[PDB]
Assembly symmetry: C3
Homo-oligomer: 315 residues x 3
């Protein structure tokens, strides 16, 4: 068996060996839980962003950054791949655990989900559950979780708080930008599942996505980070059997294509968990079908919308 929590805990302990270089900071709370600030009160870094993404994907993906251009404008890009897409993406990376503890709110991602079974239906669908005595969660939030929050997470994962780790970064941070663009393969897998395609049929995925510039606050960053995938994210996927419904994966087949993600988020009263899950999707995909040996291409890139979302100023 592969344990996404045990594998990710090893990555976190490596992060902790390089705190200063990565521009992150950890603290152990009164109950023993370790909270790793990756961008709330510290800058974080590109490498912290890569490692945060690797942790979100349960250690079952390769994630790197390459610098390239869009209409000659330079950007950093995530390039990533996985041969465990259901587990890495739906069983771990998906932000499927809404954290609310009194006034503390966070979007919860990562391996801890596979112990707490959040949401239960995902684990039924992908036929995975972790078995571990350590839990690693990734929280997207503008505040660090305290003892009571970590005690709750530990309890839900059936682990002692002394064996829980949380990575934390806000949407508007370099770790935020990198880890969200690092969901490019996940966007495809998630949309495929939403339209009814069995994620257990997905063999592998590889993706590329520009990393958003950091906008002025977390609400605006929610828009630009998501627009990276929705308007400029590319995925090559391999599946056991093709289904014609897969033409509906790309974002250009959605009723809301052309709207900046910020507008979608605003219409959901700035509540991520109130957004229709059907609205998450990659810009373009190529699907290699093992059964027929064909590769079906769907979608398109849209630099014009991306540059608007990125608040680009040309001369």
């Amino acid at each position: 068996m592969l344990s996404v929590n045990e594998i990710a805990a090893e990555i976190v302990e490596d992060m902790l060996d390089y705190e200063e270089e990565l521009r992150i900071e950890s603290k152990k709370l009164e109950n023993g839980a370790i909270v790793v600030d990756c961008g709330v009160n510290v800058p974080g870094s590109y490498d912290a962003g890569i490692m945060y993404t690797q942790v979100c994907m349960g250690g079952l993906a390769d994630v790197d950054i390459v610098v390239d251009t869009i209409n000659d404008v330079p950007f950093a890009f995530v390039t990533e791949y996985t041969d465990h897409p259901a587990i890495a993406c739906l069983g771990s990376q998906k932000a499927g655990w809404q954290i609310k503890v009194d006034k503390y709110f966070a979007m919860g991602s990562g391996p801890a989900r596979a112990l707490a079974l959040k949401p239960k239906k995902t684990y039924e669908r992908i036929e995975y559950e972790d078995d571990a005595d350590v839990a690693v969660i990734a929280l997207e939030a503008n505040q660090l979780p305290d003892e009571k929050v970590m005690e709750f997470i530990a309890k839900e994962c059936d682990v002692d708080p002394e064996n829980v780790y949380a990575l934390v970064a806000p949407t508007a941070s370099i770790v935020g930008s990198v880890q969200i663009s690092g969901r490019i393969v996940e966007t495809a897998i998630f949309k495929m599942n939403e339209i009814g395609y069995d994620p257990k049929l997905i063999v592998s995925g590889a993706g590329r996505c520009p990393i958003s510039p950091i906008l002025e606050n977390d609400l605006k960053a929610m828009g630009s980070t998501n627009d990276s995938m929705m308007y400029y994210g590319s995925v090559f996927l391999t599946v056991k059997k093709y289904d014609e419904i897969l033409k509906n994966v790309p974002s250009c087949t959605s009723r809301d294509y052309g709207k900046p993600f910020y507008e979608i988020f605003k219409a959901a009263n700035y509540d991520f968990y109130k957004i229709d899950p059907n609205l998450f999707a990659p810009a373009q995909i190529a699907v290699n079908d093992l059964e027929t040996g064909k590769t079906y291409v769907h979608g398109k890139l849209n630099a014009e919308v991306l540059f608007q979302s990125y608040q680009i100023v040309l001369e």
Copy 2:
């Protein structure tokens, strides 16, 4: 001295530490030989493909995967380089050992060739031989080798069977697609040697090549994997002295240019070793001549033919 077998053996041992993550499976045979299934009865993975390629190149190259686009369609690409091109490519990676043991047929690549001297002329031409007590071979086949096959390989390499490792994957597999596009620098070195240019004059090489989708069977896969290099493989090479003959390196100088490699394989009765070796060539090269300081560019990319070979379906 650089020992391609000792260096590659370390990579194989690393693979053995991550079998479930890599989606590979090893077995120790009754005679002690280690057979690592990288795609016959297991899926393998992109990372197993990278490591298989590294092994084929004797541990003397860098191999990685980056996701990028061709006419906006996403593909995974190999990006690779080496500063030991004659040894890594001709002395090791080249599939120069046709394995026939009774009914068992396989294409043999990798460091073990530098112990068995297969073919002998190659080692005379590159002035290299390994001296090791371990042998590592990479077999392209749709069946795993048994004790008798491994015993034969051991005997030919003058090592004990307990000191032989085999990596094995069929042409139609992700390891197959990665490792074959991972031959992009080798294709150039191989063609240069075929046209009479001394490979000892080659200082280094760097290459890029898309990774083929997996087609519906090994016969079709032989075509699409090879067409990756012939129609869309690019190599930057450095040489000590230029020769005008190098204008004939690219595939577009062949009379058979434009033919799908599948048709070439079919014409060879689906026997790789019956293919005219003059057909192996990269699409495009740049050759930096150290003597004059000039860089000569030859060849062209051909996305149109590539997409036909890849069985792309556009909307």
Copy 3:
């Protein structure tokens, strides 16, 4: 505290474990100093170039090579990023120490500058000084430093010579080409400081730059390696507060821009003091302003001048 000398010394010790693979050769002098030849009397390699660049950047950057195309012509590129740009680029990588010992001259880069404080004004500007018992210098030179040179460097750094390391390569070598293109982020940081922008405002940078072919002598190579950045180097930067003066970062805003650098240099009778210092600058930048959340784009790519500089011969 991050010690650029201690971090870089670890990278050099790694190089020393792989000399034959990297095609480098070290010598331990009578006084214990270690001189690592990376391209004077040895070929060096792409990987030795990467490691030389990492050392120049004090171990505080990520540096890799990817193969890609310019107008379809294949080149190797450096892709790199850092979240310590002031220290890594100005405090370490910049070739800011002229080493003159009798008739020996070399331009010195790398971590040892942060012990010797060369030039002092830089360390005052970036508010960094290293405190280490080891010193690591990188010399761009066509001659290896002897005992007297190394003794001098050691004394300037207040370290014993048994704890000094020098990496050395000439301009016309693969390590020269890689390490110079590996200055792409640095040339932005340096130009920014030279036009009055406080480098303490710079959060991070990410850059891409083609690696020059090796030209026929060091003088030609000085031109083509510089032109890689000036005519084809791209940088994505993040800053705390953008200033409009950053429009003057790109090389195309210099009065001397337009011809390959070798032409500019020969016209100036080989005198650096007669060339606009503002020419030494990246081709194009995108600057993410954390104040406004906008990203400002300046400059342009110039493949036509690059291909002249690179002595490209098309059919």
